[PDB]
Amino acid sequence: AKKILVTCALPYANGSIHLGHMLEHIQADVWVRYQRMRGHEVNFICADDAHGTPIMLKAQQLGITPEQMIGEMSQEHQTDFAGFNISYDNYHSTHSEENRQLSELIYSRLKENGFIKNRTISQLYDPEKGMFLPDRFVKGTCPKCKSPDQYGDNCEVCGATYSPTELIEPKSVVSGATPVMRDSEHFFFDLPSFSEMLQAWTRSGALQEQVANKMQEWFESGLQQWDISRDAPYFGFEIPNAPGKYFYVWLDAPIGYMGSFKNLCDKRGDSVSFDEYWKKDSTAELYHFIGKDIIYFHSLFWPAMLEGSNFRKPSNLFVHGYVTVNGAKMSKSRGTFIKASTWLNHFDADSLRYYYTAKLSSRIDDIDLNLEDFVQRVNADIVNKVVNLASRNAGFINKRFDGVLASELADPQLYKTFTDAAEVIGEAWESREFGKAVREIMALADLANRYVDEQAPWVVAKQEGRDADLQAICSMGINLFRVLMTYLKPVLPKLTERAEAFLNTELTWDGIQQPLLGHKVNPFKALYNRIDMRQVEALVEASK
Numbered sequence: 231a232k233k234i235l236v237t238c239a240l241p242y243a244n245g246s247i248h249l250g251h252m253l254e255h256i257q258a259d260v261w262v263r264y265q266r267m268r269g270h271e272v273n274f275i276c277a278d279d280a281h282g283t284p285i286m287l288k289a290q291q292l293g294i295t296p297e298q299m300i301g302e303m304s305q306e307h308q309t310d311f312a313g314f315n316i317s318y319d320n321y322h323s324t325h326s327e328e329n330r331q332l333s334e335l336i337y338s339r340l341k342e343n344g345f346i347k348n349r350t351i352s353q354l355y356d357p358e359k360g361m362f363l364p365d366r367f368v369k370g371t372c373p374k375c376k377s378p379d380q381y382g383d384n385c386e387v388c389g390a391t392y393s394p395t396e397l398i399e400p401k402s403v404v405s406g407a408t409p410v411m412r413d414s415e416h417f418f419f420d421l422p423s424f425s426e427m428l429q430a431w432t433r434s435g436a437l438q439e440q441v442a443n444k445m446q447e448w449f450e451s452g453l454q455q456w457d458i459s460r461d462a463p464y465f466g467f468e469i470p471n472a473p474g475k476y477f478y479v480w481l482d483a484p485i486g487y488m489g490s491f492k493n494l495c496d497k498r499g500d501s502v503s504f505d506e507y508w509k510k511d512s513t514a515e516l517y518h519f520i521g522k523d524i525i526y527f528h529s530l531f532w533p534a535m536l537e538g539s540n541f542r543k544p545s546n547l548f549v550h551g552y553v554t555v556n557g558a559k560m561s562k563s564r565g566t567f568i569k570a571s572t573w574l575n576h577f578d579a580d581s582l583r584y585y586y587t588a589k590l591s592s593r594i595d596d597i598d599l600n601l602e603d604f605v606q607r608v609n610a611d612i613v614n615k616v617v618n619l620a621s622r623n624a625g626f627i628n629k630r631f632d633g634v635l636a637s638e639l640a641d642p643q644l645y646k647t648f649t650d651a652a653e654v655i656g657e658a659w660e661s662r663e664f665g666k667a668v669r670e671i672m673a674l675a676d677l678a679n680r681y682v683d684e685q686a687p688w689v690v691a692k693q694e695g696r697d698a699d700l701q702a703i704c705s706m707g708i709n710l711f712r713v714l715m716t717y718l719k720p721v722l723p724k725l726t727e728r729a730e731a732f733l734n735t736e737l738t739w740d741g742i743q744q745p746l747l748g749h750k751v752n753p754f755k756a757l758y759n760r761i762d763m764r765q766v767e768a769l770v771e772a773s774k
């Protein structure tokens with residue numbers, strides 16, 4: 231009955247999708263698929279974050295327009311996400327008319343409401359190229375240790391940090407020219423005016439405890455005003471009434487959440503849903519799945535901007551930790567910085583979806599992809615626990631019973647044990663306690679395989695006169711498989727499709743209450759094959 235709008239953070243347009251992005255998009259997709267299974271109206275919304283100085287400069291380096299470059303990367307990203315079955319209702323771009331109109335609208339309301347301040351700043355400027363330089367486009371000699379060729383605000387030899395204005399013999403990374411200090415008028419969002427409102431959000435109990443604790447540190451330090459403008463030359467949207475000034479990504483990137491939804495509504499010819507979801511009086515739910523590095527933005531700047539422009543605020547923020555591989559941050563030299571596209575050359579999507587889901591929880595702790603454990607766990611749980619219930623039983627049904635399952639459950643009390651677990655498992659999906667859900671599902675899978683072992687169909691099948699017993703045993707196992715695959719349907723979309731083809735039925739959450747009786751199933755080739763460490767080694771080699 232609920233109306234739910236769910237986002238993931240917008241991938242930056244100047245890098246390929248990697249396993250860190252995939253943790254976030256898979257986590258959100260599992261949640262979204264569960265919510266759809268429970269009958270809710272769900273809109274899963276994302277987009278590429280496509281503006282700014284690094285994008286402008288990279289396109290100039292490539293000798294193509296920024297529009298061409300971001301279009302190519304948007305296609306690459308969407309191809310990768312589609313390969314992992316991320317079920318967006320719309321994937322748009324911050325470089326869009328919807329985002330331009332919403333950025334202009336929000337800015338105009340913030341300004342009319344007194345929340346935009348003008349301030350003159352001083353920044354390093356490349357007088358040959360004719361542009362202000364972000365810190366990382368200034369290089370020079372470390373003032374402390376005198377090491378040459380250091381970039382931005384820190385030295386990678388001695389570890390010192392300093393303003394780039396302290397670098398010795400500074401050079402523009404863009405042109406090689408010596409930069410100079412130049413003043414410019416910038417426009418700032420008066421975030422400190424929302425401090426009391428934001429403090430009340432933190433105490434409310436909606437947010438992850440770990441997230442609320444971080445916000446307390448930020449209130450202690452004191453909220454600052456945030457620059458929302460950039461000078462030309464820029465790739466982005468110009469500020470009304472301010473020639474030569476553009477919206478900085480702080481302002482336009484999250485508006486892409488709104489612009490992507492507006493695009494979806496407009497393409498559908500739906501003239502009511504945008505306001506229904508984003509007006510202050512909305513009864514729809516708004517959730518953002520994000521990582522640890524963007525908590526401050528989404529918990530402080532973003533709700534303040536929405537409040538100040540007369541829009542509703544997020545219902546909650548769902549924050550996850552970082553991905554590690556083999557216990558450490560992804561490492562290019564070790565081949566553990568793994569692209570989504572590369573992953574799919576070696577493994578299917580369901581394997582990684584399962585592995586991350588088995589590790590995920592409602593906390594912000596990091597998620598480790600241990601590659602040895604990945605092989606062991608996929609083979610143990612998918613191949614040998616869940617799919618085994620179908621593969622060990624379906625042959626007898628197809629070959630000796632014309633594909634027809636028994637007319638009654640052999641063990642109705644065991645079946646009820648499995649259906650009774652739906653409440654706790656669904657609550658675990660709902661609360662983002664994914665690891666708890668998987669543990670419960672796999673405990674049931676162990677109980678199902680225990681049942682089959684106890685009945686010993688490989689013995690019954692060779693014994694004269696026991697056809698009916700064999701059909702009963704094997705049909706019971708297949709019905710337990712039906713239930714387990716329903717619980718795993720948010721996690722394993724492709725395996726689920728194969729299971730539905732075998733079972734001749736769509737799997738629905740409520741459908742488990744009606745077992746398959748006197749019901750024709752289909753033959754299948756392997757539903758899921760084993761993986762091995764040779765494939766892991768190949769993936770690692772390919773990623774170096």
Ligand SMILES: [Zn+2]
Binds near residue numbers: 390
């Ligand atoms: Zn140094």
